[model samples]
Target: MSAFVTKAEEMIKSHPYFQLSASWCPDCVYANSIWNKLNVQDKVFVFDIGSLPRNEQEKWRIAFQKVVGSRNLPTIVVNGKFWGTESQLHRFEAKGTLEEELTKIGLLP
Candidate 1:
């Protein structure tokens, strides 16, 4: 595993809620909006993969694809479990379950 992937995995394992994102992608920002809407922005840890040095980014992407099983631009992890991607969260948001999820975790009141 690459350094970035190793570091990211450690963060994911420790953080209750975290996102793996690319700064250039709006889809990546989609999770931020939901976090903002629920006032949970501070509750999340965001790792902007695209902001890394160009050479490191490729290595991370390669390892992440093999480990994460997706080449998606963004990923949200909750309680150390993969929470799918932005599309899954968007649907949860629309259904009002997203709020409940946060509430259960004490991020939302």
Candidate 2:
């Protein structure tokens, strides 16, 4: 695991969450806002795929595919687990499930 993922796991006690997006993407904006509301800065890592040079994009893509099995935008992985899209993220927010889950898994206090 990368430093970002390792530290996130240590801080959050689960699998480190990963987010991939471009600066100009609207979905990215919305996703980021949701993450901000959840105060997940220390537990999640946002990788701006667009910021990487063309050659480097493949590196991220390969890593992402290996983990998530796809190179899709706004993908999220929690503790090495894949959890679909932002719509599914609602379970975490509306039901307040993520914190509880993390706590159950001994990640959050």
Candidate 3:
């Protein structure tokens, strides 16, 4: 499998879906609502990279620099792959369909 695909698969096995965001982010709240409404029980790890100690936060900042670049708030990494923000997710889910996509990913039965 491609590195991204392999990494994504492993991440799904090891972590529930990882969500990196700040607590005060409104966009994140919107995404959380969708996840809740959909009965998403998978692990969701929220990280306030900005709140972490400077050195610690810098690590994530460097790691996410590619996907997030300079953008702030609601940067999601699902199964170790970039999944975009809440607004982007809304568009993606609308077109891709979360249930179908989840099933394809083996995240749903």
Candidate 4:
């Protein structure tokens, strides 16, 4: 596994709800709003690549892309597994199944 992925997995164990994102990303902002609305912001582990050096940022991004099959930030990871994208979560949120989905992934009790 890529070192980036290995470290991310370590963090997933530290906190089940993980988001590989950049602070300046518009989609990430939208995703953040939804999580905040759910009252679960405190439970999230946000790895903001925005402030990191560009070298590290690019490396991590590609590493995640390899596993997620998309060069998208703010990819939701649940307990070390690739969960889905922010848009996917939006659909669940609209259907009122977001929290339920989270529970299935051991993010919510």
Candidate 5:
């Protein structure tokens, strides 16, 4: 694993929530907006792989695939466990269950 991936693993364990995403991904953009609106920036650690160099990005992509099974943007981990991809998150939002889901995951109070 690259240092970036290793760092993300550490953050995931230490933080309440961790998100792996790229700036170019619309899902990530939407997720980021929700996180900001919820005032959970302090609790969520986002690793924007788009900021990395090409080589590092490729390495991180491979590492991400190894960790999450497939390359999916806006991958989320909550309380040190895999949550789901952006599509799942969007579903929760669309169904008006985002708050409930976050509370269930111990992210929202």
Candidate 6:
């Protein structure tokens, strides 16, 4: 496995929630808003690929493709599983079941 993939796996194993994102991604912006509103900074860890060096970004992109099957921004990982993006998260929030969803993933108490 690539170094980025290995590192990502390590983070997922250690963190309750992991978000792979970029500052320029609109979806990431929306997801950040939700995370902030919920005050989950301590629960969620964010990896901003945009802040990485160009070479490191390539490594992360490769890793993202390996893990998520695409370089989609704002990829969410919960309990070492590939969760969906901000759109799905928005759907859950809109239905008032986001907390339930997080609980199902063992993120929320």
Please give the CA lDDT of all the candidate structures: 0.70, 0.64, 0.61, 0.73, 0.72, 0.76
Off by over 4 Å in 6: 1-3, 53-55
- Comparing 2 and 3 by lDDT, which wins? 2
After superposition, which runs of candidate 2 have C-alpha atoms over 4 Å from their true positions? 1-15, 90-109
Clashing pairs in 1: none
Compared with the true structure, what per-residue lDDT tens digits does model 5 show for residues 1-109? 5566677567656674667777887777887888788888875677777778878767767876766655666778666666767788778778998788778766667
What TM-scores do the predictions have? 0.72, 0.59, 0.57, 0.73, 0.79, 0.78
lDDT score, candidate 4: 0.73
Show pairs that collide, candidate 2: 15-79
Off by over 4 Å in 4: 1-5, 66-68
Summarize candidate 3's per-residue lDDT along 7-67 as a digit string, tens digits.
Answer: 5455546664667766566776776677678776454555454467767666556555543
Measured with C-alpha atoms, the lDDT of residue 101 in candidate 1 is 71
lDDT of 2 at 48: 62
RMSD of each: 2.7, 5.7, 6.0, 2.6, 2.6, 2.3
Please provide, for model 6 over 1-109, each residue's C-alpha lDDT reduced to its tens digit, 9 standing for 90 to 100: 7667778677667773678878887787887887788888886787676878878777777886886665667788766777767688879878998888788866679
**By lDDT, is 1 or 4 better?**
4
Instruction: Tally clashes: model 2.
Output: 1
Clashing pairs in 3: none
Model 5 TM-score relative to the real fold: 0.79
**What is the overall TM-score of model 3 with all chains considered together?**
0.57
Q: For model 5, what is the error of residue 32's alpha carbon versus the real structure, in angstroms, after optimal superposition?
A: 0.7
lDDT of each residue in 35-102, candidate 4, tens digit only: 77778767677767687787777787677766555576778776667778877877987899877877
Instruction: Specify the highest-lDDT model's number.
Output: 6
**What is the C-alpha lDDT profile of model 1 across 1-109, one tens digit per residue?**
5666667577667774767788777886676666666675675777777768978777766866755655567886677667667787778778988767757766666
Which pairs of residues collide in candidate 4? none
For candidate 5, list the clashing residue pairs, or say none.
none
